[PDB]
RNA sequence: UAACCGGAGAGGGAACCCACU
């Protein structure tokens, strides 16, 4: 019913008035660890190649 | 990403968000979104899940994204409102005697996202150009929205008598054709109640527009509050010393009225209320004197405060505190209760060893005739600790039943 | 080894009745701040079971004047059960009635 | 059921509106042919939203009625809410 | 400073502060607790104002230049014990593992070790670095070397080598790491008014008095009226009076020889407003603030709940043994729990494919073969 | 531990003041006379000396690690 | 549409501080000069510390922290140095840095106070603020040593400004004030009788604040700039004005390049 | 011989009984340390009442 | 470890521009100037100097985020006149103000020294 | 290779070989501290 | 690789003068742990210089 | 009428105590 998961982080929240309600601030160290898998297409192949 | 604080009780505890990357090592979220999450920024932690498939990415973007989650189906209100500083400075901003110079107006207009680049004609053109805070808030409000609300300090007789549509106190908020005509905006206009201005914005206009309507209020009001400023201090809690004497006379007359009830009880001159025993009707009469005393001192305190007060600046705006907290800081803490009754005889027919046995007086059973500004006597301090302990227990006990 | 086991683990009794014996006696001394050390060295414990909905032992009683600190208690599920010790409060040590 | 007997709503639900976009942008990510002359965008989810507004998505939706039967609704055949 | 001999004391999880100060406003019972010999906190200058909005919901704004000058800077000592021994021939031994000789060896640098198998003090270390090189012989050899805890990233303070009560060689290594206050670090007062840092501005960006006094700390006024901590305000008043007089303030509870009016009449003599309010100017525009700001010395504390001991993420890290779900813990590189209430919230959204992505694909995707006639796995 | 070099708020140097301050306290001087004898006018600088506890003296009572 | 002409008069000049008045300028210009006083005046402080021995009870980074806050007399050397991130040299040259050395060992039974006097500079002009105090005062304590303890270190001093770190902040207190009698009423006193008068006020005791004028703007800015001891307080101001002018000139050059490269 | 009993610091049979502060600093002990605890496998233990 | 380094407030990265110009499409004769690695120190005096020009109809600045180091200045001038030349005239007047102020300050310093 | 250690009690530097019982040749004390390393330490003054 | 494990000095750029140790290396760039701060950075090899 | 190098997912659990929202 409930279990551990991959691709998740946890840290302390702190205020920021200067960004919208649908935005969220993340540290670079968390973002440099959690990954998202994009499928290559001829649109993004150059960007993914540089990446 | 999806993003939650861990005691998830309703479906606004897991809401989608867009990622923005920032230098330091904490999660940062906007201050309205604190209200569904029940966040506190006092050492809270929140955990973030990243959706891995592109299909579930689209699913979160179309179902659980946060501006889509503004109005709940629990109680057909919005969940999010203006809070904690933007609300107080909104109330101070949209008052009738608020005037802005041309540089201040352009600095504030620099923080609107939904601005056409067109500067409105000021409310005063000569001797010198002056805009009004309502006139800028009319630029914040999107589309053509129409609503009518009332301010917290709106007097009841005013609608009955004359000056109904021209209010002397600048209450009765009226927004008409997307433009603030009149009124002062509090909790009852920008908060999370039904028929509030944000709710009309969500129903008449889309969720995407209401998102910008949140962010525009927060930016421009937090950038006006650098000019206005807002504090609290020890001067905010002090009184006239005409008020102090009135409070002391109220306490003295109530405390004498307790003693005469005790004398009528000892001389068997007290007849029991029907449906009650002699003990319960004695208790009822004593608590009636003490509660009427606390209310009268509280009302005297509330009448004493000035317009420039910073306790009143929050309670009128509804941002933080209540009308009993000001009375409990300035005038009288009150009676301390344990399980609805007074402080029980933990010793043999008395409470502490500093009291005579069979002392049903106010000071012997938990009433605190001192304020928080005046400090407490040690008996009253121990009784107030005994009062706070009960609620501190009930907080810990309540959770393991409510979650089950 | 019996004295050393019972003080090292906290199971207060024989090693065979490890689940029967009460635990939480002989905690590791908190050495974070000197005030934390003093408060951990002066601490009482109520061996009525936790997570019970009975508020009455957890309450602040009138016999706590001058002997136990009314303010100080952990805010968690042990409100009123763990209670620290007032300043001039002294605990008797026992003597013969003869 | 037959095209005469369509008793469900002519409106696309929020759940269908989510899942059609997800399963179309996944196809576009796997080099399916776009049904819309795009304006230079490369995000497949924006392309799927553009095809949904353009009413050109080549998917139909099978709504299972609780008796056991179903209805097949074209995405072109029903009203997009947003 | 939790004890005076903290440098001899090899102890896990030690925190000591650079510059502790005794409080300007004290009660007469701190003399007997010896608090003014081992204090925990600094007399800050707080200002209770809504400055930018980074202090709003119980948070706090800090002076970056004061933090640069050493304000609440602390240092964290972590110590590691290790004990060689256990079999008939399976001898543990401290040495440098060699890639030709020893079997299993991490990518980490082992050149930081001395040839005893230990590091000398004064060496910078980081996450996934050896500290104690220990090998057991293989019936060639396999290591049991201990690593520095991931994300700890400190410098070795001292290394002690000795013998246990079993006559075996025994080592304890203590590692410094200084901790500068950053945003997210949890601070508090002496009045139950806690809070995490939300932003740090420099001295230029911070508001200022008629003099160049800028507050080290800014807190929100909306933490006062519901909490009703009026002792915080009286402390902030008595601290200004005591710092101008030269006296240490007296805040014993039931004194009755001191109240707010006497403190106000004292403060009126030193050239201030009698209620503690002052006229601060905006640090950005220079315009003076329309409200007058309540400001003064208040004794704040630094709690042990940093953010760098709590932040952790995961993307397909290690896996449990019995069931093939992720681990638990910041130290074991564990995963968060998508528990029974969170699946329930995702049911209530009606997002079943995200629910399946959480509970099946992100935890343990797996396949079996089952007979088509009887449903037992083949 | 030891006296800080600069005031945290002001940035004025306070690190050279401490031994002079202890010298002035070993006289008829009160604290309120000794601080402005040293020229500390702002209370941000006055709290640096007035609230300091000098634990380096207690640390020097222990034998060192070497000789 | 043009610039205004400000005037200056000094009311106090001291080795410790300067007190002066600026007329006929804007609040923004006045604040930015107040702000470049704090952040963007280049000064010399030590930034590179190598410790060869530390047998004391204060650990290494505590000592390097206390060494960085020690100010260094850089009145004219800081104008002719270069930032070490900009100089062509490898690790350090005398055109980009200044070398300091500290080798102190305690041998007597008396506690050895290591002070800022025990720093030995490479250049005689760049030294700490034990320079001239004649017409008895102590020097900046670094560490106290027991018999048998010692420390040896070598350090280098760079040019920087206080936007990086507060050790490059040349000032102690920058008092700033405009409109001492509340004539513009940028602030609003609820009970104006309770407020003490300023130092620059011109009122009798009868009156508590000036009468409101709608036409007025902020002028007559009163500054008091207190130095730490590294720069003279009179040459903090000139260097801040030159730095702000140089910054504006560089910004105008970049904008000129953008405009003529856009057309 | 019966055994060995773990023993409380700063007690009447601890080795730190009645020592002066200088002698405690000679033994690398803290004079402000109150005692009242046991040292068992090099770990302080405190009997909660 | 997520601490950004102290030099990042004022040092341009490689490939960054100190200044960027973008025309504002909503209204005529308006433009947005984005400055990298500057703060209120420069934007406030630029805004105040622009507001002395009667041919400037709108002028303002903002920082989009304090942790970011960027500043945006929006200028709108009357037709016959450009926001770009308004900006560079404000700079070349503000430099003249600072130069005059520096000269008069050093003269008053010399006059304070025995005069 | 010599690996000089320092006696905790008598502060005597002494060379002990690898795989040897820990003991100081004078006063017989059994706690050694190692020594400070030789490689460079460089710190910012921040 | 040769550079891994070697104490190095950044000799160009804003990080000039910071001593560190090389954790990882490529021909284009390398990863250096800073001795002063608790942060690991990526720097080009042109800026690096081997010391000791 | 020439020129030497090469190996990689580790790693456990139970119990108790303290603490955080
Ligand atoms: Mg909270
Ligand atoms: Zn100061
Ligand atoms: Zn150079
Ligand atoms: Zn020895």
Question: Domains plus CATH for chain G?
Answer: 1-42+167-263 (3.30.1360.10), 43-166 (2.170.120.12)
- Give the sheet arrangement for strand B45-49, strand by strand: B14-16, B2-4, B45-49, A8-15, B27-29, A23-26, B18-21
State phi, psi for G6 to the nearest 5 degrees.
Answer: -85, 155
Query: Domain spans of chain J?
Result: 1-46
Long-range contacts for C64-68 (Cβ within 8 Å, ≥24 apart)?
Answer: C65/B352, C65/B353, C65/B382, C68/C44
User: Which residue range forms the structural domain that includes residue B208?
Assistant: 86-226
* Strand residues in E192-262 grouped as ranges (E): 195-201, 217-219, 249-250
Distance CA C72, CA C36 (A): 12
Distance CA E217, CA E60 (A): 7
Q: Of the candidates J40, J41, J45, which has its C-beta nearest G47's C-beta?
A: J45
Distance (Å) from CA G34 to ligand 2 centroid: 18
Residue B150 near residue B171, CB atoms below 8 Å: yes
Peptide bond into B339 cis (omega under 30): no
Could you tell me the CATH number of the domain that includes residue B218?
1.10.274.100
Distance CA G66, CA F4 (A): 8
Contact D44 A42 (CB under 8 A): no
User: Which residue range forms the structural domain that includes residue D16?
Assistant: 1-82
Residue E281 near residue E208, CB atoms below 8 Å: yes
- Tokens 């309600």 -> residue: A21
**How do strand A23-26 and strand B18-21 relate by DSSP bridges?**
parallel
Element (H, E) at E137: strand E134-137
- CB hemisphere CA count around G229 (13 angstroms): 20
Contact I1 K39 (CB under 8 A): yes
Long-range contacts for B244-248 (Cβ within 8 Å, ≥24 apart)?
Answer: B246/B300, B247/B297, B247/B300, B247/B301, B247/B331, B247/B332
Nearest nucleotide to E147 (CA to C1') is L11
Residue C45 near residue C81, CB atoms below 8 Å: yes
Of residues E82, E79, E97, the one with CA closest to residue E162 = E82
Of residues B331, B340, B320, B314, the one with CA closest to residue B371 = B331
Assign 3-state DSSP to chain A and report helix, strand, coil percentages, each to 5.
20, 25, 55
Residue G230 near residue G73, CB atoms below 8 Å: yes
C7 CB closer than 7 A to any strand L atom: no
Distance CA E195, CA E335 (A): 27
Residue B172 near residue B180, CB atoms below 8 Å: no
CA of B342 to C1' of L20 (A): 35
Contact C80 B385 (CB under 8 A): no
Residue G30 near residue G22, CB atoms below 8 Å: yes
For Cα atoms E106, E110, E116, give the angle at the middle one, nearest 5 degrees: 125
Residue B305 near residue B295, CB atoms below 8 Å: no
Q: What count of other Cβ atoms lies within 10 Å of the Cβ of residue D62?
A: 8
**How do strand A3-4 and strand B27-29 relate by DSSP bridges?**
unpaired
What are the structure tokens assigned to E2, written together? 């939790």
Ligand nearest to the CA of E195: 1
DSSP states along I13-82: PTT--SEEEEE-SSSTTEEEEEEES--HHHHHHHHHHHTT-TTEEEEEEE-S-SSS-EEEEEEEE-TTS-
Long-range contacts for C42-46 (Cβ within 8 Å, ≥24 apart)?
Answer: C42/C84, C42/C85, C43/C82, C43/C83, C43/C84, C43/C85, C43/H48, C43/H49, C44/C68, C44/C82, C44/C83, C44/C84, C44/C85, C44/H48, C44/H49, C45/C81, C45/C82, C45/H48, C45/H49, C46/C80, C46/C81, C46/C82, C46/C83
What are the structure tokens assigned to G16, written together? 């410790």
What's the structural domain count of chain D? 1
Distance CA B319, CA B188 (A): 11
For Cα atoms G35, G41, G45, give the angle at the middle one, nearest 5 degrees: 130
H helices of chain C, in order, are 2-9, 34-41
Point out which residues pair with G155 in neighbouring strands.
G49, G100
Instruction: Reduce the DSSP state of residue J45 to 3 states and report it.
Output: coil
- Closest residue to L6 (CA to C1') is K1
Of residues G5, E367, A13, the one with CA closest to residue B42 = A13
Nearest nucleotide to E317 (CA to C1') is L9
Give residues with Cβ within 8 angstroms of I105, minimum separation 6. Answer: G8, G20, G237, G238, G241
In CATH, what number does I1-115 get? 3.30.1360.10
DSSP states along B250-318: HHHHHHHHHHHHHHHHHTT--PPPTTS-HHHHHHHHHHHHHHHHHHHHHHHHHHH--TT-HHHHHHHHT
Residue B245 near residue E291, CB atoms below 8 Å: no
Distance (Å) from CA B188 to ligand 2 centroid: 45
Give residues with Cβ within 8 angstroms of B303, minimum separation 6. Answer: none
State phi, psi for G124 to the nearest 5 degrees.
Answer: -75, -20
Q: Which of H9, H35, H42, H44 to mutate to test the interface with C (most CBs of C within 10 A)?
A: H44
B103 touches chain I (CB under 8 A): yes
Of residues A25, G257, E204, G236, the one with CA closest to residue I10 = E204
Phi/psi-derived region of residue D9, left when phi > 0, alpha when psi is between -120 and 50, beta in every other case:
beta
SS3 of chain G: CCCCCCEEEEEEECCCEEEEEEECCCHHHHHHHHHHCCCCCCEEEEEEEEEEEECCCCCHHHHHHHHHCCCCCCCCHHHHCCCCCCCCCCCCCCCCCEEEEEEEECCCCCCEEEEHHHCEECCCCCCCCCCCCCCCCCCCEEEEECCCCEEEEEEEEEEECCCCCHHHCCEEEEEEECCCCCCCCCCCCCCHHHCCCCCCCCCCCCCCCCCCCCCCCCCCEEEEEEECCCCCHHHHHHHHHHHHHHHHHHHHHHHHHHHHHHC
Annotated binding-site ranges of E: 371-374
Distance CA D68, CA B43 (A): 52
Distance (Å) from CA I11 to ligand 3 centroid: 18
Distance CA A47, CA B17 (A): 24
Point out which residues pair with E80 in neighbouring strands.
E173
Residue B201 near residue B144, CB atoms below 8 Å: no
Inter-axis angle of helices B310-317 and B86-93, nearest 10: 100
Instruction: Reduce the DSSP state of residue C36 to 3 states and report it.
Output: helix
Residue E203 near residue G38, CB atoms below 8 Å: yes
Nearest nucleotide to E310 (CA to C1') is L20
Give break positions in chain E: residue before each, C–N beyond 2.5 Å: 85, 139
Give residues with Cβ within 8 angstroms of B340, minimum separation 6. Answer: none
Q: Which chains touch I (3 or more CB pairs under 8 A)?
A: A, B, E, G, K
DSSP for residue B84 = T
- Give the sheet arrangement for strand E92-94, strand by strand: E92-94, E134-137, E141-143
CA of E149 to C1' of L11 (A): 14
Of residues B264, B207, B222, the one with CA closest to residue B69 = B207
Instruction: Reduce the DSSP state of residue E200 to 3 states and report it.
Output: strand
Q: Of the candidates F13, F62, F65, which has its C-beta nearest G71's C-beta?
A: F13
Of residues E190, E184, E217, the one with CA closest to residue E66 = E217
Contact E40 C38 (CB under 8 A): no
Radius of gyration of chain D (CA): 14
Point out which residues pair with B221 in neighbouring strands.
none
Give the C-alpha distances (Å, rounded to integers) separating H45 from B212, C25, E83, H38, H41. Answer: 58, 9, 22, 5, 10
Contact F8 E42 (CB under 8 A): yes
- Give the sheet arrangement for strand I19-23, strand by strand: I19-23, I30-36, I70-77, I56-62
Residue A14 near residue B28, CB atoms below 8 Å: yes
**How do strand E217-219 and strand E42-48 relate by DSSP bridges?**
parallel
Chain B residue closest in CA terms to E226: B321
Residue G102 near residue G51, CB atoms below 8 Å: no
Residue B190 near residue B90, CB atoms below 8 Å: yes
Residue C70 near residue B392, CB atoms below 8 Å: no
> Domains along chain F?
1-67 (1.10.10.60)
How far is C-alpha B350 from the geometric centre of its chain's CA atoms? Answer: 39
Q: Which chains touch H (3 or more CB pairs under 8 A)?
A: C, E, F
Inter-axis angle of helices B323-330 and B310-317, nearest 10: 160
- Tokens 């401490």 -> residue: F18
Give residues with Cβ within 8 angstroms of G42, minimum separation 6. Answer: G78, G79, G159, G160, G161, G168, G239, G243
Inter-axis angle of helices B207-228 and B197-204, nearest 10: 150
State phi, psi for C16 to the nearest 5 degrees.
Answer: -70, -45
Inter-axis angle of helices B54-63 and D44-54, nearest 10: 60
Residue E67 near residue E204, CB atoms below 8 Å: no
In chain A, positions 5-44, which contact chain B (CB-CB < 8 Å)? 5, 7-31, 34, 36-37, 39
What are the structure tokens assigned to B286, written together? 């004593």
Q: What count of other Cβ atoms lies within 10 Å of the Cβ of residue E374?
A: 8
**How do strand G112-115 and strand G221-227 relate by DSSP bridges?**
unpaired
Residue G34 near residue G150, CB atoms below 8 Å: no
What are the structure tokens assigned to E248, written together? 């240490």
Is E58 considered catalytic here? Answer: yes
Architecture in CATH of J1-46: Single Sheet (2.20)
Q: Which chains touch G (3 or more CB pairs under 8 A)?
A: B, E, F, I, J, K
DSSP for residue E49 = B
DSSP for residue H44 = E
Count Cβ neighbours within 10 Å for each residue of G172-194 and write b for 16 or more, e otherwise.
bbbbbbbbbbbebbbbebbeeee
Distance CA D33, CA D37 (A): 11
Could you tell me the CATH number of the domain that includes residue D50?
3.90.940.10
- CB hemisphere CA count around B403 (13 angstroms): 11
* Strand residues in E182-265 grouped as ranges (E): 186-188, 195-201, 217-219, 249-250
Distance CA H42, CA H48 (A): 19
Of residues I58, F54, E151, G161, the one with CA closest to residue B119 = I58
What are the structure tokens assigned to B87, written together? 């609300």
Give break positions in chain C: residue before each, C–N beyond 2.5 Å: none
What are the structure tokens assigned to G96, written together? 């980009």
Element (H, E) at D77: none
Distance CA D25, CA D33 (A): 11
DSSP states along K1-52: --STT-EEEE-SSTTTT-EEEEEEE-SSEEEEEESSSS-EEEEETTTEEE--
Residue H22 near residue H46, CB atoms below 8 Å: no
Q: What count of other Cβ atoms lies within 10 Å of the Cβ of residue B35?
A: 19
DSSP for residue I5 = P
Radius of gyration of chain A (CA): 16
**Judging by beta carbons within 10 Å of its beta carbon (0-12, 13-18, 19+), is residue K1 exposed, middle or buried?**
exposed
Resolution in A: 3.1
What are the structure tokens assigned to H35, written together? 């005692």
Count Cβ neighbours within 10 Å for each residue of E148-183 and write b for 16 or more, e otherwise.
bbebbbbbbbbbbbeeeeeeebbbbbbbbbbbbbbb
Residue G41 near residue G243, CB atoms below 8 Å: yes
Give residues with Cβ within 8 angstroms of E367, minimum separation 6. Answer: none
Of residues B155, B156, B151, B148, the one with CA closest to residue B195 = B148
Distance CA B236, CA B326 (A): 10
Nearest nucleotide to C23 (CA to C1') is L16
Element (H, E) at B390: helix B378-402
Of residues E362, E327, E308, the one with CA closest to residue E180 = E308
H helices of E246-358, in order, are 260-267, 340-349, 352-356
G50 touches chain J (CB under 8 A): yes
Residue G207 near residue I82, CB atoms below 8 Å: no
Give residues with Cβ within 8 angstroms of B332, minimum separation 6. Answer: B247, B251, B293, B294, B297, B298, B368, B369, B370, B371
Rounded-to-10 torsion of CA B263, B264, B266, B269: 160
Which structural technique was applied?
cryo-EM
Give the C-alpha distances (Å, rounded to integers) separating B173 from B158, B167, B313, E14. Answer: 14, 10, 18, 58
Which of strand L's nucleotides are less than 7 A from any protein C-beta?
8-21
| Residues from chain A contacting residue E340 (CB–CB below 8 Å) | 1-2
């Amino acid at each position: 019913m409930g279990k551990r998961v991959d691709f998740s982080a946890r840290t302390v929240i702190t205020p920021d008035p200067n960004l919208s309600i649908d935005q969220v601030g993340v540290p670079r160290s968390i973002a440099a660890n959690m990954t998202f898998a994009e499928i290559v297409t001829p649109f993004n192949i150059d960007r993914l190649q540089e990446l | 990403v999806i993003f939650n604080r861990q005691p998830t009780l309703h479906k606004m505890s897991m809401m989608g968000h867009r990622v923005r990357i920032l230098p330091w090592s904490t999660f940062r979220l906007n201050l309205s979104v604190t209200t569904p999450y029940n966040a506190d920024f006092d050492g809270d932690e929140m955990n973030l899940h990243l959706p891995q498939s592109l299909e579930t990415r689209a699913e979160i973007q179309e179902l659980a994204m946060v501006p889509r989650m503004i109005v709940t189906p629990q109680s057909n209100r919005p969940v999010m409102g203006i809070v904690q500083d933007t609300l107080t400075a909104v109330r101070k901003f949209t008052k009738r005697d608020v005037f802005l110079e041309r540089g201040e107006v352009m600095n504030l207009l620099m923080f609107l996202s939904t601005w056409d680049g067109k500067v409105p004609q000021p409310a005063i053109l000569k001797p010198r150009p002056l805009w009004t805070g309502k006139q800028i808030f009319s630029l914040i409000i999107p589309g053509h929205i129409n609503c009518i609300r009332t301010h917290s300090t709106h007097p009841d007789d005013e609608d009955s008598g004359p000056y109904k549509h021209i209010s002397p106190g600048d209450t009765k908020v009226v927004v008409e054709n997307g433009e603030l005509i009149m009124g002062i905006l509090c909790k009852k206009s920008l908060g999370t109640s039904a028929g509030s201005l944000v709710h009309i914005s969500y129903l008449e206009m889309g969720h995407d527009i209401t998102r910008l309507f949140y962010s525009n209020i927060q930016t421009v009001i937090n950038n006006w509050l650098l000019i206005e400023g807002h504090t609290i201090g020890i001067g905010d809690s002090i009184a006239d010393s005409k008020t102090y004497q009135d409070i002391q006379n109220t306490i003295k007359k109530a405390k004498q009225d307790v003693i005469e009830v005790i004398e009528k009880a000892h001389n068997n001159e007290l007849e029991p209320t029907p449906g009650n025993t002699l003990r319960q009707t004695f208790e009822n009469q004593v608590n009636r004197i003490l509660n009427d005393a606390r209310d009268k001192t509280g009302s005297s305190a509330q009448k004493s405060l000035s317009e420039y007060n910073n306790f009143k600046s929050m309670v009128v705006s509804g941002a933080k505190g209540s009308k009993i907290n000001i009375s409990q800081v300035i005038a009288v803490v009150g009676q301390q209760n344990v399980e609805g009754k007074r402080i029980p005889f933990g010793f043999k027919h008395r409470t502490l060893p500093h009291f005579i046995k069979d002392d049903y007086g106010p000071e012997s059973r938990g009433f605190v005739e001192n304020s928080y500004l005046a400090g407490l006597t040690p008996t009253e301090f121990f009784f107030h600790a005994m009062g706070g302990r009960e609620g501190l227990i009930d907080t810990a006990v309540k959770t393991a039943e409510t979650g089950y | 080894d019996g004295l050393k086991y019972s003080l090292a683990t906290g199971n207060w009794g024989d090693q065979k009745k490890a689940h029967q014996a009460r635990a939480g006696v002989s905690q590791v001394l908190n050495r974070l701040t000197f005030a934390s050390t003093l408060s951990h060295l002066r601490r009482l414990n109520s061996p009525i079971g936790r997570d019970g909905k009975l508020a009455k032992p957890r309450q602040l009683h009138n016999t706590l004047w001058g002997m136990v600190c009314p303010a100080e208690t952990p805010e968690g599920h042990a409100v009123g059960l763990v209670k620290n010790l007032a300043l001039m409060a002294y605990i008797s040590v026992g003597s013969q009635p003869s | 059921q037959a095209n005469q007997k369509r008793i469900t709503t002519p409106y696309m639900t929020k759940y269908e509106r989510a899942r059609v976009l997800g399963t179309r942008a996944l196809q576009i990510a796997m080099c399916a042919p776009v049904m819309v002359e795009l304006e230079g965008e490369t995000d497949p989810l924006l392309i799927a939203m553009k095809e949904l507004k353009a009413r050109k998505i080549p998917i139909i939706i099978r709504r299972y009625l609780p008796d056991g039967s179903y209805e097949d609704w074209g995405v072109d055949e029903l009203i997009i809410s947003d | 400073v939790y004890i005076t001999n903290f440098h001899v004391r090899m102890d896990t999880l030690a925190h000591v502060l650079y510059y502790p100060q005794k409080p300007l406003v004290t009660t007469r019972s701190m003399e007997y607790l010896r608090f003014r010999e081992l204090p925990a906190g600094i007399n800050s200058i707080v200002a209770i104002a809504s400055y930018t909005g980074y202090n709003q919901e119980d948070s706090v704004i800090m002076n970056r230049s004061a933090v640069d000058r050493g304000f609440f800077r602390s240092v964290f000592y972590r110590s590691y014990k290790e004990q060689e021994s256990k079999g008939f021939d399976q001898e543990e031994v401290f040495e440098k593992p060699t890639r030709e000789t020893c079997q299993g060896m991490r990518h980490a640098i082992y050149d930081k070790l001395d040839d005893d198998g230990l590091i000398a003090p004064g060496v910078r270390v980081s996450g996934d670095d050896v500290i104690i090189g220990k090998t057991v012989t293989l019936p060639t050899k396999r290591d049991c070397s201990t690593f520095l805890r991931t994300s700890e990233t400190g410098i070795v303070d001292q290394v002690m080598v000795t013998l246990n009560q079993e006559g075996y060689k025994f080592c304890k290594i203590r590692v410094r790491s200084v901790r500068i206050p950053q945003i997210g670090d949890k601070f508090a007062s002496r009045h139950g008014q806690k809070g995490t840092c939300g932003i740090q501005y420099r001295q230029e960006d911070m508001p200022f008095t008629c003099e160049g006094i800028t507050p080290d700390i800014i807190i929100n006024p909306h933490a006062i009226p519901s909490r009703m901590t009026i002792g915080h305000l009286i402390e902030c008043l008595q601290g200004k009076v005591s710092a101008n007089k030269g006296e240490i303030g007296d805040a014993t509870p039931f004194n009755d020889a001191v109240n707010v009016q006497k403190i106000s009449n004292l403060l009126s003599d030193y050239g201030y407003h009698l209620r503690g309010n002052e006229v601060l100017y905006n640090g950005f525009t220079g315009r003076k603030i329309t409200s007058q700001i309540f400001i003064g010395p208040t004794y704040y504390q630094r709690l042990k709940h940093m953010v760098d001991d709590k932040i952790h993420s995961r993307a397909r890290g290690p896996i449990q043994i019995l069931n093939r779900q992720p681990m638990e813990g910041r130290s074991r590189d564990g995963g968060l729990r998508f528990g029974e209430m969170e699946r329930d919230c995702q049911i209530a959204h009606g997002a079943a494919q995200f629910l399946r992505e959480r509970l099946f694909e992100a935890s343990d995707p797996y396949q079996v073969h089952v007979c088509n006639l009887c449903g037992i796995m083949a | 531990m030891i006296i800080p070099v600069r005031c945290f708020t002001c940035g004025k140097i306070v690190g050279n003041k401490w031994e002079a301050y202890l010298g002035l306290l070993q006289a008829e001087y009160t604290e309120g006379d000794a601080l402005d004898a040293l020229g500390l006018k702002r209370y941000c600088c006055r709290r640096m000396l007035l609230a300091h506890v000098d634990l380096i003296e207690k640390l020097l009572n222990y034998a060192p690690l070497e000789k | 549409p043009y610039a205004n002409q400000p005037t200056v008069r000094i009311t106090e000049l001291t080795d410790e501080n300067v007190k002066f008045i600026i007329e006929n300028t804007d609040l923004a210009v006045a604040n930015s000069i107040r702000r470049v006083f704090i952040a963007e005046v280049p000064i010399i402080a030590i930034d590179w510390v190598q410790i060869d021995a530390n047998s004391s009870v204060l650990h290494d980074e505590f000592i390097a922290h206390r060494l960085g806050l020690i100010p260094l007399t850089s009145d004219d050397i800081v104008d002719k140095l270069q930032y070490s991130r900009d100089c062509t040299c490898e690790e350090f040259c005398p055109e980009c840095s200044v070398e300091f050395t500290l080798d102190v060992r305690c041998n007597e039974d008396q506690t050895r106070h290591v002070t800022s006097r025990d720093l030995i500079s490479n250049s005689p002009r760049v030294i700490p603020v034990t320079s001239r105090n004649r017409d008895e005062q102590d020097d900046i304590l670094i560490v106290k040593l027991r018999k048998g303890q010692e420390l040896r270190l070598r350090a280098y001093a760079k040019k920087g400004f206080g936007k990086e770190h507060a050790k490059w902040n040349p000032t102690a207190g920058v008092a700033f004030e405009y409109d001492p009698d509340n004539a513009l009423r940028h602030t609003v006193y609820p009970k104006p009788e309770e407020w003490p008068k300023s130092e620059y006020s011109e009122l009798d005791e009868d009156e508590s604040q000036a009468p409101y004028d709608p036409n007025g703007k902020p002028e007559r800015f009163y500054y008091n700039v207190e130095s730490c001891g590294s720069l003279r307080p009179e040459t903090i101001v000139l260097s801040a004005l030159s730095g702000l002018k140089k910054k504006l000139s560089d910004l105008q050059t970049q904008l000129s390049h953008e405009i003529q490269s856009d057309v | 011989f019966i055994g060995k009993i773990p023993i409380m610091l700063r007690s009447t049979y601890c080795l730190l009984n009645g020592l002066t502060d200088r002698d405690l600093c000679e033994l690398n002990e803290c004079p402000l340390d109150p005692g009242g605890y046991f040292i068992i496998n090099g770990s302080e233990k405190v009997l909660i009442a | 470890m997520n601490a950004p380094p102290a030099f990042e407030s004022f040092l341009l990265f490689e490939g960054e521009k100190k200044i960027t110009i973008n025309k504002d499409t909503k209204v005529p004769n308006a433009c947005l100037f984005t400055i990298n690695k500057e703060d209120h120190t420069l934007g406030n005096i630029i805004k105040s100097q622009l507001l002395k020009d009667p041919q400037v109809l709108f002028a303002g600045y903002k920082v989009p985020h304090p942790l970011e180091h960027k500043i945006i200045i929006r200028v709108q001038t009357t037709p016959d006149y450009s926001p770009q030349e308004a900006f560079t005239n404000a700079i070349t007047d503000l430099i003249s103000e600072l130069s005059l102020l520096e000269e008069r300050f050093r003269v008053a310093i010399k006059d304070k020294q025995e005069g | 290779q010599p690996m000089i250690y320092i006696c905790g009690e008598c502060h005597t530097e002494n060379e002990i070989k690898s795989r040897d019982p820990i003991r100081c040749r004078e006063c017989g004390y059994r706690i050694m501290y190692k020594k400070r390393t030789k490689r460079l330490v460089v710190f910012d003054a921040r | 690789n040769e550079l891994i494990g070697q104490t190095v000095r950044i000799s160009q750029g804003p990080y000039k003068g910071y001593i560190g140790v090389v954790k990882d290396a490529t021909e284009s760039t390398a990863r250096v742990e800073l001795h002063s701060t608790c942060q690991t950075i990526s720097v080009d090899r042109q800026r690096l210089t081997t010391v000791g």
